[PDB]
Curated annotation (Swiss-Prot), chain A:
Subcellular location: Virion
Positions in coiled-coil regions: none
GO biological process, one term: viral tail assembly
Main function: Intermediate baseplate protein. Involved in the tail assembly.
GO cellular component: virus tail, baseplate
Pfam families: Phage-Gp8
UniProt keyword Disulfide bond present: yes
UniProt entry keywords in alphabetical sequence: Disulfide bond, Viral baseplate protein, Viral release from host cell, Viral tail assembly, Viral tail protein, Virion
UniProt name for this protein: Baseplate wedge protein gp8
Native source species: Enterobacteria phage T4
Family recorded in the similarity comment: Belongs to the tevenvirinae baseplate structural protein gp8 family.
Subunit structure, as described in the record: Homodimer. Interacts with gp7. Part of the baseplate macromolecular complex which consists of gp5, gp5.4, gp27 (central spike complex); gp6, gp25, gp53 (inner baseplate); gp7, gp8 (intermediate baseplate); gp9, gp10, gp11, gp12 (peripheral); gp48 and gp54 (proximal region of the tail tube).
Disulfide topology: 140-151
InterPro entries reported in the protein's UniProt record: Gp8_sf, Phage_T4_Gp8
From Swiss-Prot, chain B:
Function: Intermediate/inner baseplate protein. The gp25-(gp6)2-gp7 module is involved in sheath contraction. Involved in the tail assembly.
Family according to the record: Belongs to the T4likevirus baseplate wedge protein gp7 family.
Gene symbol of the encoding locus: 7
Region annotated Disordered, chain positions: 78-98
Subunit structure: Heterotrimer with gp6; assembles as a (gp6)2-gp7 heterotrimeric molecule. The (gp6)2-gp7 heterotrimeric molecule further interacts with gp25 and gp53. The gp25-(gp6)2-gp7 module is involved in sheath contraction. Interacts with gp8. Binds to gp10 homotrimer; disulfide-linked. Heteromultimer with gp10; a gp10 molecule is disulfide-linked to gp7 and the other two remaining gp10 molecules form a disulfide bond.
Full-protein residues shown: 935 to 1032 of 1032
Annotated protein name in UniProt: Baseplate wedge protein gp7
Membrane-crossing segments per the record: none
Cellular location(s): Virion
Curated annotation (Swiss-Prot), chain D:
Function summary: Peripheral baseplate protein that is part of the tail fiber network. Connects the short tail fibers to the baseplate. During infection, the baseplate undergoes a conformational change from a dome-shaped to a star-shaped structure. At this point, gp10 rotates and acts as a lever that unfolds the short tail fibers, which then interact with host cell surface receptors. Involved in the tail assembly.
Originating species: Enterobacteria phage T4
Cellular location(s): Virion
Stated family: Belongs to the T4likevirus baseplate wedge protein gp10 family.
Quaternary data: Homotrimer; disulfide-linked. Heteromultimer with gp7; a gp10 molecule is disulfide-linked to gp7 and the other two remaining gp10 molecules form a disulfide bond. The gp10 trimer interacts with gp11 trimer and with the short tail fiber (STF) composed of the gp12 trimer. Part of the baseplate macromolecular complex which consists of gp5, gp5.4, gp27 (central spike complex); gp6, gp25, gp53 (inner baseplate); gp7, gp8 (intermediate baseplate); gp9, gp10, gp11, gp12 (peripheral); gp48 and gp54 (proximal region of the tail tube).
Induction of expression: Expressed in the late phase of the viral replicative cycle.
Protein name in the entry: Baseplate wedge protein gp10
Length: 332, 98, 143, 76, 143, 111
């Protein structure tokens, strides 16, 4: 083939913006989408449900698959923007329950300061660091090569063969070097207040703030001090390359009118629909867009709004305890 | 062919009318021995050469140019290889990832 | 004004035509024949066209002609423009569209400096021409 | 009546024109005049020559004016 | 005169148009914009405006008309310009342009052949009525 | 051309969904007039043609407030080098970009 050829790749930063686009898209007024979570499907399918494996009916996106859904919907909850949050993969420094506790690739964000085996500063904060460099020893990445720098040119991912003693101790970029001792040049990036970490962060993911909550104070997030050639560089959601978002809601918040049915027989399939219209008595009424807080699905028009996601799952009967949690973590 | 952008299409492919080459090639003619009103230097160079080096310019002497818009050069167009059913047959460019 | 240029080779393929240069020509025509009436817009061709609308301020000003108040009911008016007195304008008064008690005054839309500050006007005079207003600005019922 | 475009210029080879856009202007220029006096005209200066020709009805109808005869033979 | 064809349109990269036949249309936007209005234009818009200088013999005619000076002290002059069985001319004379004894004179710029050697035009007449025409050459103050 | 569709009032207007559009492209007109520098006899316009988001003005002297950049065809200088975040990248080895020849870029995303 002889022709002009161009080699192009979308940057990862495109994703985080797209993520930032789904957030802010939640609001009351028009042009702001409103998402609902739906459960429903009270009646059991087959008899092999409640057994092991066996799979559910695989859900389809056709019109027939939507119609029945609206007939079985037991209840719904409206997602408010507050209960949605950004998230990133968390690597706790020097934790033995996750791979490579003492070793780190060229750039990997790693939280420290939480749990005793990493100490660094006190006054909590759950400090986080990007790690800009590594000791040079040990064979790494493509083919053989030998040395770090040559392995850093020609692409490559260099894994240090020397355990990194002690966590990153400082508040500012490139905390390594400056002493005969080893370690490598971690770079502070923000902080996580203790109050949010007990709620908003699970052990799989650590929250990173929306470029909003960083306003109405930065300090709570330990971002109060920064180089910032720009007046702000305010949103750091780009700095981490945060690729994903996470939802959380308590099942006490979802609204079941019947209130004895979801408990006795589980909701077998969950789907999330967008922009439902309110109940219209007859096609004599103008189209209104759904607001307030609960919506017994009787008050939702059938096929009223489009549905981005369907799940089919075995019965997942729910206890009425005031804590059980939805997750539904989006990867945008 | 005819007057009004003669013989609109063939009706076989519809769209725009065919174009016959007409007068083909040769010298660009001397221009009216000056061609430069003020003999100015226009955009990094004098007016007598350049200042209008473009091989395609309206003469008023033909209906080839129409109005407003632009004329598109279809000899060189960067052609998406993989795409919708239509496609530009043999492609001009190709995207090969790393 | 009998001075106008027709722009270059007129016909077919050729090597003859104007250098894109023409527009410069076609630039001039619109200039000249705009300088025809520099500000001027006569009503007389359209003279009764405009005012038929209700209580029309009907600004013909600075130059233009305007009005009838044809069907009247209009309680109509006309307007002025400010000074600068280059001696150009026209105005259609009640024109050839049958006037009625709607009448008007040159003071009854906006005076600026014009109309001479005189006020109101009489009932249907229409037949032939009622008024020419004046060129420039400052003027009474126009002589 | 003086509100019309300039429609670009020839400076050297140069750039800024509208380079065939100006029709939408050029039109307005014409569209200024042929409609500015548009439903009417000046009859007197061009309404002179013709009727030096025959007496024939010579329609001037519904705009301007035409036949002054400026000479003998029946005046039309 | 409502006769001119609008030369089509554009459409982006383009389909159909002039094909260099635009001026051969467009030049015609000039004809009924000339040979309808061709020779005698409207002076009295710009035809009081050119005498702002003195008694000088500025001669406006062969088309329209010019000199009312807007002002006194002009000692205003005039010419009707030549003869020859045209029938085309007019002017504003003083009108709203106000000249005190500045007058203007059909002599003053040397009317020459026709006009019957009749003197001038009014002294300060300025306001209201005006010195109007010389049809072809000939006027004895044809106003 | 709607109001023929009774299924419109079913789910509000809008329909980009029913078509299953699922793809977006934007284009840009590069006119050598806006960049008279660069466009000289010999400019070779070698590769690199990006995209970006939300840039900023020169700021004059660095201490100041900052403004969102709304004016077309900003020069490379005045942009606060590396303002905004780069959302796309491409390399097309020559192109041409001679004067008086506009340039039309089509880029197509499925997002």
């Amino acid at each position: 083939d002889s022709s002009v050829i161009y080699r192009a790749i979308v940057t990862s930063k495109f994703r985080t913006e797209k993520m930032l686009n789904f957030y802010n898209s939640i609001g009351s007024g028009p042009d702001k989408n409103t998402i609902f979570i739906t459960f429903g499907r009270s009646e059991p399918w087959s008899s092999n449900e409640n057994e092991v494996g066996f799979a559910p009916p695989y859900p389809t996106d056709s019109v027939l698959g939507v119609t029945d859904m609206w007939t079985h919907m037991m209840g719904t909850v409206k997602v408010l923007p507050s209960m949605l949050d950004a998230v990133i993969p968390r690597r706790d420094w020097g934790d033995t329950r996750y791979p490579d506790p003492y070793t780190f690739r060229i750039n990997d964000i790693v939280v420290c300061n939480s749990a005793p085996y990493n100490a660094t500063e006190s006054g909590a904060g759950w400090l986080v660091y990007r790690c800009l460099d590594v000791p040079d020893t040990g064979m790494c990445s493509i083919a053989s090569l030998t040395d770090k720098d040559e392995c850093l040119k020609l692409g490559g991912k260099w894994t240090p063969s020397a355990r990194s003693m002690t966590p990153p101790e400082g508040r500012g970029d490139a905390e390594g070097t400056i002493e005969p001792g080893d370690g490598y040049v971690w770079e502070y990036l923000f902080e996580i207040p203790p109050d949010v970490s007990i709620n908003r962060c699970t052990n799989e993911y650590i929250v990173v703030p929306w470029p909003e909550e960083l306003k109405e104070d930065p300090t709570r997030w330990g971002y109060e001090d920064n180089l910032t050639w720009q007046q702000d560089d305010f949103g750091l959601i780009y700095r981490v390359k945060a690729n994903t978002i996470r939802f959380k809601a308590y099942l006490d918040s979802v609204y079941f009118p019947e209130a004895a049915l979801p408990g006795n027989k589980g909701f077998r399939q969950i789907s999330i629909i967008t922009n439902p219209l309110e109940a219209k008595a007859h096609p004599n009424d103008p189209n209104v867009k759904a607001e307030k807080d609960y919506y017994d699905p009787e008050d939702l028009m059938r096929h009223s709004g489009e549905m981005i996601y369907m799940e089919n799952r075995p019965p997942i009967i729910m206890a009425m305890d005031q804590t059980e949690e939805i997750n539904i973590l989006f990867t945008f | 062919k005819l007057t009004p952008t003669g013989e609109i299409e063939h009706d076989s492919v519809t769209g725009e009318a065919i174009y016959e080459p007409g007068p083909m090639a040769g010298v660009k003619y001397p221009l009216p021995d000056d061609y430069n009103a003020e003999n100015n230097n226009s955009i990094f160079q004098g007016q007598l050469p350049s200042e209008r080096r473009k091989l395609m310019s309206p003469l008023f002497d033909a209906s080839g140019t129409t109005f407003a818009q632009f004329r598109d050069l279809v000899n060189k167009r960067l052609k998406d290889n993989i795409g919708n059913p239509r496609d530009p047959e043999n492609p001009t460019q190709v995207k090969i990832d790393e | 004004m009998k001075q106008n240029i027709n722009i270059g080779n007129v016909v077919d393929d050729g090597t003859g035509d104007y250098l894109r240069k023409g527009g410069i020509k076609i630039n001039e025509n619109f200039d000249e024949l705009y300088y025809e009436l520099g500000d001027g817009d006569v009503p007389y061709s359209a003279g009764a066209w405009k005012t038929y609308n209700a209580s029309s301020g009907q600004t013909l000003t600075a130059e233009w002609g305007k009005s009838y108040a044809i069907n009247t009911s209009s309680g109509r008016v006309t307007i002025n423009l400010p000074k600068g007195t280059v001696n150009d304008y026209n105005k259609v008064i009640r024109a050839r569209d049958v006037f009625a008690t709607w009448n008007v005054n040159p003071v009854t839309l906006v005076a600026a400096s014009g109309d001479t500050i005189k006020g109101s006007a009489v009932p249907v005079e229409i037949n032939v021409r009622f008024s020419d207003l004046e060129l420039v600005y400052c003027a009474p019922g126009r002589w």
